[PDB]
C-alpha cells in the first residue's frame, strides 16, 4: 500500500560520499518500480551494488545502472533482458525525477537516470518511476565529476544499496 524507498551510497573514486533515497512509484507503475527495487535489493542475486554512474551531464542527468558491460551498452531487468514501457503516466518535470534509459520501444532492463533539470522531451518516451526523497545535495555534488560528453571525472559508484523502513 505504501509506496517504498530505496537508498544509494555513493562513493567517488572510493570515499565515501553520501545517502540518495528515493521513492518508487508502485502505485502508477508496480512492474517498473518493482523491477528497481529488487535490483536495489539484490534478492534476485544480481543489481545495482557496486555499479557506476558512466554518463554525468550537469544540467541534464545521472545515468547508470549497467551492472553488465559497465558503459550504456548493458542490463538486464528481474523480468528477462528487456521489458515493455509500462505506461506513461508520469513526466519529466524537473530534478530528482528517475525515469528508465532504453535503446527503442519497449527495451527496459536495469539502466536509468536521475534528471538534474526538466526533461521534458522525453515524455511518452522513457518511463518515470520515482524520484529522489533525500539527498538531491548528494546528487548535486555527483554531477560535479560530469562533463559535456558525459565522462566523469573520478568513478562515481553505488558502494551499497537497498530497501529502507
Ligand atoms: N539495453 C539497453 C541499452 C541502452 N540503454 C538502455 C538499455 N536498457
Redesign the pocket.
Known amino acids: 500500500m505504501v509506496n517504498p524507498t530505496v537508498f544509494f551510497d555513493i562513493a567517488v573514486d572510493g570515499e565515501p560520499l553520501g545517502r540518495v533515497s528515493f521513492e518508487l512509484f508502485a502505485d502508477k507503475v508496480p512492474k517498473t518500480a518493482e523491477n528497481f527495487r529488487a535490483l536495489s535489493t539484490g534478492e534476485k542475486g544480481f543489481g545495482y551494488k557496486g555499479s557506476c554512474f558512466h554518463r554525468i551531464i550537469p544540467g541534464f542527468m545521472c545515468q547508470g545502472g549497467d551492472f553488465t558491460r559497465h558503459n ?4 538486464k531487468s528481474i523480468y528477462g533482458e ?1 521489458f515493455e514501457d509500462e505506461n506513461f503516466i508520469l513526466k519529466h518535470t524537473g530534478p530528482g525525477i528517475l525515469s ?4 527503442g520501444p519497449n ?5 536509468f537516470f536521475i534528471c538534474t533539470a526538466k526533461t521534458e522531451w522525453l515524455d511518452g518516451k522513457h518511463v518515470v518511476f520515482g524520484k529522489v526523497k533525500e539527498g538531491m545535495n548528494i546528487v548535486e555534488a555527483m554531477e560535479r565529476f560530469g562533463s559535456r560528453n558525459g565522462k566523469t571525472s573520478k568513478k562515481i559508484t553505488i558502494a551499497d544499496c537497498g530497501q529502507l523502513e
Open positions: 550504456g551498452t548493458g542490463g528487456k528508465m534509459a532504453n535503446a527495451t527496459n532492463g536495469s539502466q
